[PDB]
Amino acid sequence: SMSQSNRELVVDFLSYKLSQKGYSWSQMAAVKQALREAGDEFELRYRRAFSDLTSQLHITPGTAYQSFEQVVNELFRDGVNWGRIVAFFSFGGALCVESVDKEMQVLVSRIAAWMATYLNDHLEPWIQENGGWDTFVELYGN
Amino acid sequence: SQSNRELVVDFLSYKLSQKGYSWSQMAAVKQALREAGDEFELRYRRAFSDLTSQLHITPGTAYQSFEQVVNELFRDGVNWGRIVAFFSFGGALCVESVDKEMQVLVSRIAAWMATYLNDHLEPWIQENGGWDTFVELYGN
Ligand SMILES: Cc1ccc(CN(C(=O)N[C@@H](CSCc2ccccc2)C(=O)O)C(=O)c2ccc3c(c2)CCN(Cc2ccccc2-c2ccc(Cl)cc2)C3)cc1
Numbered sequence: 188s189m190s191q192s193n194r195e196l197v198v199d200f201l202s203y204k205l206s207q208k209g210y211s212w213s214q215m216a217a218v219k220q221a222l223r224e225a226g227d228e229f230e231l232r233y234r235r236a237f238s239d240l241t242s243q244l245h246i247t248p249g250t251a252y253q254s255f256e257q258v259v260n261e262l263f264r265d266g267v268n269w270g271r272i273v274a275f276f277s278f279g280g281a282l283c284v285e286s287v288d289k290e291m292q293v294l295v296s297r298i299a300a301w302m303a304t305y306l307n308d309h310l311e312p313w314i315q316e317n318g319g320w321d322t323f324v325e326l327y328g329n
Numbered sequence: 330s331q332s333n334r335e336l337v338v339d340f341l342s343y344k345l346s347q348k349g350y351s352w353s354q355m356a357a358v359k360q361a362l363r364e365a366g367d368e369f370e371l372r373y374r375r376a377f378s379d380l381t382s383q384l385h386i387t388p389g390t391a392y393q394s395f396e397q398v399v400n401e402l403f404r405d406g407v408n409w410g411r412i413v414a415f416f417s418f419g420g421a422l423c424v425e426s427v428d429k430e431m432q433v434l435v436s437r438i439a440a441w442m443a444t445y446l447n448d449h450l451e452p453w454i455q456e457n458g459g460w461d462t463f464v465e466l467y468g469n
């Protein structure tokens with residue numbers, strides 16, 4: 188328990204320090220780091236679209252899924268691409284922050300579950316057809 | 330998939346941390362330690378380079394170098410600042426191993442760090458309120 192959590196902290200810290208030098212702890216660590224960076228990049232470049240989105244958000248536990256679904260359906264209306272997948276993660280992140288800001292922290296675990304289901308059902312088939320997350324890492328790094 | 334749930338959790342942990350929030354207690358510790366490591370490495374830019382002048386890392390001498398540095402680091406006792414330096418040292422030794430084309434040493438360094446943490450740091454950590462105390466102190 189303390190043993191597993193100590194190994195987890197070590198792995199997390201070393202994954203981070205290796206990534207800062209262009210190295211990686213594992214394939215999964217390389218995906219996680221490249222997605223974190225892509226999220227930061229997307230949010231900064233589309234800071235206006237991010238600001239317009241958060242301003243229009245009126246989060247309540249009863250309308251949270253509705254808001255999630257409407258944005259995600261609009262986002263992927265014309266199909267899937269890596270850029271839109273990054274925007275999907277950025278949107279989930281913004282909805283979680285907005286939930287915590289509005290003292291609705293209970294929504295965070297729900298949003299993560301909705302994201303994971305949407306990924307499994309609607310994004311994973313396209314991801315697998317397009318070479319998987321390794322292709323994303325390769326394309327983003329280039 | 331398990332890996333898709335893991336990516337979601339990782340991304341959300343990061344975005345919540347950027348606003349001073351956290352996904353979980355464990356995510357808050359990981360993020361506070363990553364930041365403290367970055368801060369220590371910026372404040373002491375030449376600390377590892379001053380050590381490398383004598384640490385010629387090889388699979389045969391890596392453990393002896395790790396053990397000596399870590400024993401010298403904690404000679405006067407444990408504190409949070411030295412624990413951060415311990416993680417930064419491990420990180421630097423892993424980078425140096427990959428630079429010297431001996432990435433096979435990375436998983437051994439990780440195992441040595443985890444054993445030192447379990448055996449020699451965890452009693453002081455637990456006596457000092459656990460990793461929550463570190464998060465509280467670093468955030469202040
Ligand atoms: C890191 C990064 C990611 C994405 C881009 C932009 N981008 C492209 O550069 N695309 C490429 C094709 S992918 C190439 C690629 C990219 C990354 C890695 C690997 C390969 C192209 O065009 O050549 C897009 O695709 C792209 C994707 C989504 C959106 C835009 C553009 C424009 C703004 N729009 C707002 C929006 C509309 C509807 C519904 C919701 C939201 C919305 C989502 C979240 C919030 Cl928080 C707020 C609002 C979302 C730029 C940088």
Ligand SMILES: Cc1ccc(CN(C(=O)N[C@@H](CSCc2ccccc2)C(=O)O)C(=O)c2ccc3c(c2)CCN(Cc2ccccc2-c2ccc(Cl)cc2)C3)cc1
Pocket residue numbers: 364365366368369372373376377380398401402408409410411413414415417418421463466467
């Ligand atoms: C985020 C942060 C952490 C630590 C500090 C610095 N620092 C202090 O400021 N400490 C405090 C008391 S703890 C306060 C605290 C800190 C963080 C969180 C919470 C509370 C003080 O004194 O006021 C120290 O403790 C401290 C600890 C270790 C060392 C130093 C200073 C100076 C350099 N020295 C080199 C060295 C010597 C022997 C063996 C190995 C190495 C060596 C380790 C790793 C490599 Cl990579 C290379 C070489 C190691 C500064 C910022």
